[PDB]
Design a protein around this nucleic acid. Structure first.
Lengths: 75, 97, 109, 83, 95, 95, 109, 97, 83
DNA sequence: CCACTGGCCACTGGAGAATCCCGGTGCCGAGGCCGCTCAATTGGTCGTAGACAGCTCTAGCACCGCTTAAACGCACGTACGCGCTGTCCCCCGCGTTTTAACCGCCAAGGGGATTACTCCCTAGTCTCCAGGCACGTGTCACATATATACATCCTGTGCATGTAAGT
DNA sequence: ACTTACATGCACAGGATGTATATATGTGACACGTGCCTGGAGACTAGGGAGTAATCCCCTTGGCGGTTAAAACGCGGGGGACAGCGCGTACGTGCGTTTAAGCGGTGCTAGAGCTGTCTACGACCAATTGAGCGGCCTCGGCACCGGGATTCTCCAGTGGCCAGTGG
């Protein structure tokens, strides 16, 4: 079971604080390194990231949808 | 609900059928119309054996179908399954024309 | 008092007419003189080549369970032997069609 | 008597049938006109040679032998019609 | 009555009768076989005549014929044809 | 002691001078030219011989020569060659 | 007693040897007989083609500012003419090189 | 700071150099060594005209270089600038090789 | 007298030069081996034809004109070598 | 905080459909016989083409000694394949309407095909001579080298611009 | 909501380099004169392939009715083409080093090539026939048709799984 993936995505974007947003490939590698079955949950992580953008808790830096770079909010 | 196959499935069935079949795929009479049209462009009142027309037909479709597997290899070479004419010009240029 | 005439094909034990081949070579304008054993050799290698292509055609017909050779059998035989295939790579066959080939990338998942 | 447009007699289903025998899955619409052009260009390339054989034979009727000579001149040898 | 058109039908018919006594033949495929034989004969005599020119020889002999066979025909097919032709030349040598 | 070898050096030299008095040539460029002359000569000769074969013709006349020139030469090269050969036939007819 | 020997190439007003090419045609074994005007016609078309390629080569060498032609000039002449290229698509020139040809997609920006 | 050109700029410079050039790109001595090696496979004790090996040299290099512009056509048709082998056997198979 | 690894004689920058005359600006590291295979296979074809001419010539020294025959028999005509 | 509930995804079975497979059935090419004829065969001859030996000479093979040019290799960087996703629109597919292709039937005559005939040209032979070819020689177009001149490519750098922090 | 400080981007100047260009110089390869001989011209002839005329018939062309299967058109939808973003890696480029190619020189000879001989072989020609081709008749393999089995496709139903939300 384990915790839901939303706070896992927030930890993925919170791991680095690069000056631009984290890319989708980098966060996929982050969940791979921390430990998560990323292969069967591509739809799950994409819906989670899109949901987290739509709440405004995450703001997407450059891309649209699942593409580009994803950074944390202002506060 | 009316039946409908997903795209390409029926198509692949005609690849199976027409690779199984051996006959000419075009209508012979518009073809010989084209032949007489082009022949008139060279000299008048040309008369034709039907077997000559059939030989022209089969040789023409053979050259074309050869261009078709050339175009298929070109399209999958560009990681595509839909053909665009640039494949055919590339095929003609590698073939030397 | 002339002896009984055999044929040069019979003297070579062959099926193709050595005499007709020799006549076509003489009238084919290849040389003004013809060696005796050359049309014999030519008829022999011709009989060989026809033998394997006919054998492959018969095997294809038996696989296609028809007792009569059709040009589709000829195509399927000739394209499946790569030496004979590139031998006749620029040769087009009457009513042969093509080998049944679909690319695996064109095949669905 | 005269003919002005028979290249459109090469119908879209006929082109698609040639594609299926060529094993093509998906065909753009722009394939059709250039395909017609390529095939017809091939046709005058062969039929010029064939007719030149025909008035070479002093004939006004074109035979299959002239076709055979023209095609295997261009290295496109065909069986089933010679003889 | 019309002119005789010489054909290869009966000889290759006999050949198919040794290699497959059971099967039949279609006549237009039989004409395909005739075109095949005429075409490869034309080729092989072509480089044979050219080679006889190159070595400046007035007579077409079997040595350049087998040279022409292994010139056109590939590999094991060529050496097989060499074998049957060689034994046939020995048979006609023994008449 | 040597044996004579035939080439087109004098004739092509005359041609290049009468088209260009000021222009020279290298010897292996002349080898390229000789190979060109022999190549197109053997092409046109084999085609003419096969034309005589198809028409069952014993004698190579200029009709099949001009036919094969029209056959092999692409585009306006063919028409100019036919014109030049016709003119040469005209003077040789008058001579 | 006999007329002075006059050359057939002069009779056609040509440079190529009519007698030589006639002998070549006779000994090339193309037929047992040959008409008189056919080698004349052949010499004319040969002389025309040589004149064309020599004009193009001289133009190339003049553009190269060279008095003496080189097979680089021959390659440039033979490939920059479409009819000559279709004549010799399958023919290679020793030390001719290739055309200076770059794809625009290979260029920067 | 030492001088250094960016990638491609050099590469197009020798592209221009070898296109205007007509001269040989392979060292001839390993070429004759390789020709003698592969000719030993068919027949022993073979001797060689130097001009024969030269004719082999331009014939081989012309064949392969023609395959290279064909490979260029394949790569740009696949929208790339870097070649892979699949370009080469593609071009050969369309050529019938 | 024995030769074993002369396929390595086509050096790596030589292959790069051959690509540059072919107009390639960027080549992979995976190209050299199959180019070696293609060039060698072409070579056994042509030298096989030439040596077939050579024992037909009954010589053990190959000549350039036989090489000319060997190359033209597949239609790869070369000029300037006695052709 | 936890359990109820709703959205999303994968598996699966069933229905439909297209094709493979089994018989029947009439049909027309395959094949086999027959009659004719003309081309292979027999036999002999004569000239000659190439095999065979033998001399010659030349070019290729081998070896070596310097002598750089190039191959290799390493290293560092950046440009490019390429993988993913997102989006848009183009074409497979299926139904409906149309139409002309095809069969087949008949009329007609146009030209290929075949035979006869007589003759224009050309292979062949003899004689003779002249033009091209091997060879020697000389000589200037061009290769090579070196010194200027410009092109061009890359990168620092000053100015313009969008955006975060302070007010 | 306004003003000010900072990262970003972009055009230009300049320098480093590579490529063109001008001029001097040898050199050897191109060009030109020479002897010659063999191959091309002159003249005549045999004869024979071939131009031309006549015929016929058969094979091609044109036209007319019916049919239907194939083509054209429309809807639509999904899946494939393609744009973009990021990312890693893998050649591009530059410098040192090895070494191997290459050029020059020398010696060997074995085999390419020319030359005489002669003889096995192959072209040429009269006789003749039987093998092989044109025509005809029959039939059975096979194309077409009809009915059922099978196998492949697709989609709706259902189970699993995750997350929101309200009690």
């Amino acid at each position: 079971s384990g915790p839901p993936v939303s706070e896992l995505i927030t930890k993925a974007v919170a791991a680095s604080k690069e000056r631009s947003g984290v890319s989708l490939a980098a966060l996929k590698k982050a969940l791979a390194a921390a430990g998560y079955d990323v292969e069967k949950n591509n739809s799950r992580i994409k819906l989670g990231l899109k949901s987290l953008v739509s709440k405004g808790t995450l703001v997407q830096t450059k891309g649209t949808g699942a593409s580009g770079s994803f950074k944390l909010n202002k506060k | 609900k009316p039946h409908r196959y997903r795209p390409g499935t029926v198509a692949l069935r005609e690849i199976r059928r027409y690779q199984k079949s051996t006959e000419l795929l075009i209508r012979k009479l518009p073809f010989q119309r084209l032949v007489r049209e082009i022949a008139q462009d060279f000299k008048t009142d040309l008369r034709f054996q039907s077997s000559a027309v059939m030989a022209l037909q089969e040789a023409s479709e053979a050259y074309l179908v050869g261009l078709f597997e050339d175009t298929n290899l070109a399209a999958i070479h560009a990681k595509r399954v839909t053909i665009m004419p640039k494949d055919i010009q590339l095929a003609r240029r590698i073939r030397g024309e | 008092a002339r002896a009984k005439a055999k044929t040069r094909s019979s003297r070579a034990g062959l099926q193709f007419p050595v005499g007709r081949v020799h006549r076509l070579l003489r009238k084919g304008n290849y040389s003004e003189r013809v060696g005796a054993g050359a049309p014999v050799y030519l008829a022999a290698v011709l009989e060989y080549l026809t033998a394997e292509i006919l054998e492959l055609a018969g095997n294809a017909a038996r696989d296609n369970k028809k007792t009569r050779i059709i040009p589709r059998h000829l195509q399927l035989a000739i394209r499946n032997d790569e030496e004979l295939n590139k031998l006749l790579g620029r040769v087009t066959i009457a009513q042969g069609g093509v080998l049944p080939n679909i690319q695996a990338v064109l095949l669905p998942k | 008597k005269v003919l002005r447009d028979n290249i459109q007699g090469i119908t879209k289903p006929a082109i698609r049938r040639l594609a299926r025998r060529g094993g093509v899955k998906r065909i753009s619409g722009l394939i059709y006109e250039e395909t017609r052009g390529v095939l017809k260009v091939f046709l005058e390339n062969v039929i010029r040679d064939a007719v030149t054989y025909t008035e070479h034979a002093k004939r006004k009727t074109v035979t299959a032998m002239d076709v055979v000579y023209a095609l295997k001149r261009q290295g496109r040898t065909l069986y089933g019609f010679g003889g | 009555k019309r002119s005789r058109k010489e054909s290869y039908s009966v000889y290759v018919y006999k050949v198919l009768k040794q290699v497959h006594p059971d099967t039949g033949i279609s006549s237009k495929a039989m004409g395909i076989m005739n075109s095949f034989v005429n075409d490869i004969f034309e080729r092989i005599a072509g480089e044979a005549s050219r080679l006889a020119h190159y070595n400046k020889r007035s007579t077409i002999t079997s040595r350049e014929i087998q040279t022409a066979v292994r010139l056109l025909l590939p590999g094991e097919l060529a050496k097989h044809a060499v074998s049957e032709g060689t034994k046939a030349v020995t048979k006609y040598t023994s008449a």
